[PDB]
């Protein structure tokens, strides 16, 4: 059972890149708290719980900070209160990936007026990835995954009628979200390799 109400509850609970990395490490704590309030999440084997979170942090954090930033149509609102603008990201050498985020997520979510419930559903769909290698039972994960988008098409059709393709429009941001999510990994892996860019403790455990 995946009531769309409980998922909405879970969501409601210098160097620019360095400031972005300080914030990624901080939000990783909040991510772990978010997943725990997802219906039936904490009931999984921690063998799987760790795999689900270690396979989607780049994508769950990308979505979160993207939705915060629907208000500031200039750059990104970070979890620490700092705003990173297109110029700071371009002048610091990350303009390429930073423009995608604004283009493919922040602005798309603004134009369709995506709310905090559809975001929690979409993050929860990303969370329950049955394609994550080494899961104890990928079938139970996908069982929970189907339960989620079921509550989302139902929520879409009732709250947003006369918009039959809004439920599909939402799911067609998951490919973009992954394209970006893997690009931040490669970017983050690279900052660690060069080693002259600070990285906090939790962000390393997530980079193996």
């Amino acid at each position: 059972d995946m009531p769309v109400e409980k998922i909405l509850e879970a969501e409601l609970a210098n160097d620019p890149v360095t400031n972005i990395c300080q914030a990624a490490d901080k939000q990783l704590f909040t991510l772990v708290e978010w997943a725990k309030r997802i219906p039936h999440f904490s009931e999984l084997p921690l063998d799987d719980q760790v795999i689900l979170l270690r396979a989607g942090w780049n994508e769950l954090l990308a979505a979160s900070a993207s939705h915060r930033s629907i208000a500031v149509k200039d750059g990104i609102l970070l979890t620490t209160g700092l705003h990173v603008h297109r110029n700071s990201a371009h002048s610091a050498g990350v303009g390429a990936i930073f423009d995608r985020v604004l283009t493919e997520l922040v602005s798309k979510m603004r134009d369709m007026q995506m709310d905090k419930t559809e975001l929690g559903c979409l993050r929860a769909i990303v969370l329950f990835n049955p394609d994550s290698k080494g899961l104890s039972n990928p079938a139970e994960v996908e069982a929970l995954r189907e339960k989620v988008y079921a509550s989302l098409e139902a929520y879409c059709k009732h709250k947003y009628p006369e918009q039959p393709g809004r439920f599909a429009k939402l799911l067609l941001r998951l490919p973009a979200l992954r394209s970006i999510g893997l690009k931040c990994l490669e970017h983050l892996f690279f900052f660690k390799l060069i080693g002259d860019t600070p990285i906090d403790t939790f962000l390393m455990e997530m980079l193996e």
Partner: peptide, 9 residues
């Protein structure tokens, strides 16, 4: 895998 394990209890 320490901080991730601990953060779940």
């Amino acid at each position: 895998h320490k901080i991730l394990h601990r953060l779940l209890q």
